[PDB]
Amino acid sequence: MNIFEMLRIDEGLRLKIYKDTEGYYTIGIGHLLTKSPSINAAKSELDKAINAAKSELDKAIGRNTNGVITKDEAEKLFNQDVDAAVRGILRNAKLKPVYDSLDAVRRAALINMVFQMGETGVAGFTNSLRMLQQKRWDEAAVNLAKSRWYNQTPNRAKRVITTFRTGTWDAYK
């Protein structure tokens, strides 16, 4: 198991533009496109958005696709995304250090968070981060759980948390 397989599981795979739990238009392996609008919107709106998401996609892939892509394409996007998450982490004054202190498995967990919630979002978990740095496994997990993230996506948060707590991939077995 590794980062790719890990997120592959947590994020799923889809070749058609769908929308995430947080009302975002996305595709492939969790590839964000555009903020979705509220249903209280009409054609003007909705279509405008579909439109926009669509453009984003085209732009990303470099071709006209009418909201649909291939596996190869997704996998490409995917890699790029993992890469990026891994750069935010290194570019971040708060993440870099936590990251460095962690074992390979746990590193993976951090990347996941980052990938799921952006470097900005993640750096926001100051207490949890510190705890991670002190290697206070269980405390962190408790801290981590007291979050929007957990409450919103519990199953996924669970796997991640456990991962941090055990330094193993059991949660993913």
Curated annotation (Swiss-Prot):
Q: Which GO terms describe its cellular component?
A: host cell cytoplasm
Q: Which GO terms describe its biological process?
A: cell wall macromolecule catabolic process; defense response to bacterium; peptidoglycan catabolic process; viral release from host cell by cytolysis
* Main location group: host cell
Q: Which residues form the signal peptide?
A: none
Spell out the catalytic residues: 11, 20
Checking PANTHER family in the record gives: T4-TYPE LYSOZYME 1-RELATED
Q: What is this protein called?
A: Endolysin
Species, as recorded: Enterobacteria phage T4 (Bacteriophage T4)
